[PDB]
Amino acid sequence: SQEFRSYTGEGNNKQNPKQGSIFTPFIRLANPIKFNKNGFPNITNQPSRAISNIIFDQQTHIGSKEHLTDMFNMWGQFLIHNMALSKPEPNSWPIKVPKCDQYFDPACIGNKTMNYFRTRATEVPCDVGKTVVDEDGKCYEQINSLGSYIDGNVLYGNSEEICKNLRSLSGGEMKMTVTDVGDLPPKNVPGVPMDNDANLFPIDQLYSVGERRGNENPGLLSIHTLLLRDHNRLARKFARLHPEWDDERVFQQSRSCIIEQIQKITYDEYLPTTLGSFPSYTGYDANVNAQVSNEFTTTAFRFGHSEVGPFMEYYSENGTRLQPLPIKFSYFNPHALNRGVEPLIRGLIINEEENIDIYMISDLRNFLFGKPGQGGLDLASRNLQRNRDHGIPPYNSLRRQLGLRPVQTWSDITSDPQIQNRLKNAYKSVDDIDSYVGGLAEDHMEGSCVGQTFYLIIYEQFFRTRAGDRFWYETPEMRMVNRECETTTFAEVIKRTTSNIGYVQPNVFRK
Ligand code: HEM
Ligand SMILES: *[C@@H]1O[C@H](CO)[C@@H](O)[C@H](O)[C@H]1NC(C)=O
Ligand SMILES: *[C@@H]1O[C@H](CO)[C@@H](O)[C@H](O)[C@H]1NC(C)=O
Ligand SMILES: *[C@@H]1O[C@H](CO)[C@@H](O)[C@H](O)[C@H]1NC(C)=O
Ligand SMILES: *[C@@H]1O[C@H](CO)[C@@H](O)[C@H](O)[C@@H]1O
Ligand SMILES: [Ca+2]
Ligand SMILES: [Cl-]
Ligand code: NA
């Protein structure tokens, strides 16, 4: 009776069963400032949408200075969906639109807003860890509505019941939609609630995968598809190798391989690209907590929104460039896979992404439901709100609490005058800068695509989600379990799972 991971994350740490499990408070690297959970946070800086217009506005293409690909940030978005979800409660703190905003209030009605709901929170002890006494006299911490471990929840769901509805229960395989253009994920699966944020298409047309927001964009769904194909491929092998294994055993052995495949790409390919390198595994530490930190998911790792390019490229088998799909048209759009995943994959690995800086494309920052005065969303604003919702300390306060030296003037953050000016325009002091905008404004660390601050927060998180993981693939007991897997590089998984994909570079995150 071999022991396999749970679907929720609990049981991973023997001494602290719930450690890292779903629906548990986030960790803090730095004390939060009072965020007044039950009301609005007391913010003296400019509102989120103002900071968005002043700092994040983008009018031209910059292009990744590190020469990274769209596939790189598709994995980043795929990676975070394995780790953290800040699920909101019906606790409304709307985003105020400045009067006369050309994108959300051209008629100059100064009461226009964008929907925002504060993250689920729970009362915590005031004399434990890094918290703060809220303005109502109690201490609160935000709740991670997802397992903190990299455990394939993106494919298999967050519980037994959801998992056994996504899988065929035959040969240990996952349900799939067989089509004229390869195998695609399933649809209309009972018990698998899928997100429809943009609400362009009816939910019965969305694909049913282990992660609610899997339909967010097609490039994300494509990654889901290939790892599902690779899963059913391994299940057929284990079925032939071990005919005595029932459906449950073939599935788990296949699930175990895919989890290892996800982990290996992250720590052998993704992180060395993000941070320039990464130390080698040093063994499981039962005293390390793998739980996600509030600053990691809220602040540091949200850099990807800066790097998303405006267009999604499509290429055919013979290498011809097809009509690019603009991001704004791809939000929760299953039609993007009508011609299979191969045309997307080709575009993702060849097309260079956007630079990680203060600028965010307008597909994300100025997305509209229709006319310029009725509805829409601003991802830059949502991030600022979330940081202020969670009580992320100011830029210089965070650095101090991370063991870094605080900045003294604007030039200490960057030499680019236009960045300096936009910071002067948005904030009157460096000690008023939001950690999110400050870390983005920093110069990239040597060999990295992020600044010193974000570098430190990201490095600190992924050290723990590896060291604190009892089922980490590099541990002796897990090399034994996964002795018949076929874990390779991401580029080779693509070839294994695609039809006539064409040329694929070894590192699909670069060039
Ligand atoms: C649409 C969105 C994306 C691309 C078209 C996109 C992309 C990324 C990348 C590439 C990331 C990291 C490398 C990344 C990180 C995180 N995102 Fe995320 N993202 C899109 C849309 C959203 C939306 C909407 C949210 C929630 C907005 C809000 O906070 O109100 C979002 C969140 C995050 C996030 C926080 C994780 C969490 O706890 O939910 C990241 C670390 N992304 N995105
Ligand atoms: C808001 O913060 C300012 C200082 O940042 C403080 O003077 C003021 O009293 C605070 N307001 C509330 C309602 O807490
Ligand atoms: C905002 O509230 C309603 C929105 O329907 C609007 O009629 C009203 O004029 C606005 N309030 C102002 C402008 O003070
Ligand atoms: C093959 O290449 C030609 C050349 O432009 C292109 O028009 C056609 O769509 C391609 N068809 C494929 C790859 O099936
Ligand atoms: C915070 O605390 C309770 C414990 O009583 C949790 O069950 C729940 O998540 C709430 O939001
Ligand atoms: Ca950018
Ligand atoms: Cl500098
Ligand atoms: Na997880």
Residue numbers in the entry: 21 to 531
List sentences from the manuscript.
DdPoxB belongs to class B of the family of so-called dye-decolorizing peroxidases, whereas DdPoxA is a member of the peroxidase–cyclooxygenase superfamily. Phylogenetic analysis demonstrated that DdPoxA belongs to family 6 of this heme peroxidase superfamily, shares a striking sequence similarity to the mammalian heme peroxidases, and has a signal peptide for secretion. The metalloenzyme is shown to follow the halogenation cycle and to catalyze the efficient two-electron oxidation of iodide and thiocyanate. Its high efficiency in H2O2-dependent iodide and thiocyanate oxidation and its expression at multicellular lifestyle of D. discoideum together with its antibacterial activity suggest that this secreted and highly stable glycoprotein acts in the first line defense of the fruiting bodies containing spores against bacteria.
Fig. 4A shows the overall largely α-helical structural organization of DdPoxA. The protein is composed of 21 α-helices of varying length. The central core of the molecule consists of five long α-helices (H2, H6, H7, H8, and H13) with the covalently attached heme group. The conserved distal residues Gln-97 and His-101 are found in helix 2, whereas the proximal His-325 belongs to helix 8 and the proximal Asn-403 and Arg-406 are part of helix 13. The important catalytic residues on the distal heme site (His-101, Gln-97, and Arg-233) are fully conserved, including Glu-236 that forms an ester bond with the 1-methyl substituent of the heme porphyrin ring. However, DdPoxA lacks the covalent ester bond that is formed between the heme and the distal aspartate in LPO, because the corresponding residue in DdPoxA is an isoleucine. In LPO, the Ca2+-binding site consists of the residues Asp, Asp, Ser, Tyr, and Phe, and in DdPoxA, the ion is coordinated by Asn-102, Gly-167, Tyr-169, Asp-171, and Asn-173. The polypeptide chain of DdPoxA contains eight cysteines, six of which are involved in disulfide bridges (Cys-120–Cys-128, Cys-146–Cys-159, and Cys-277–Cys-505).
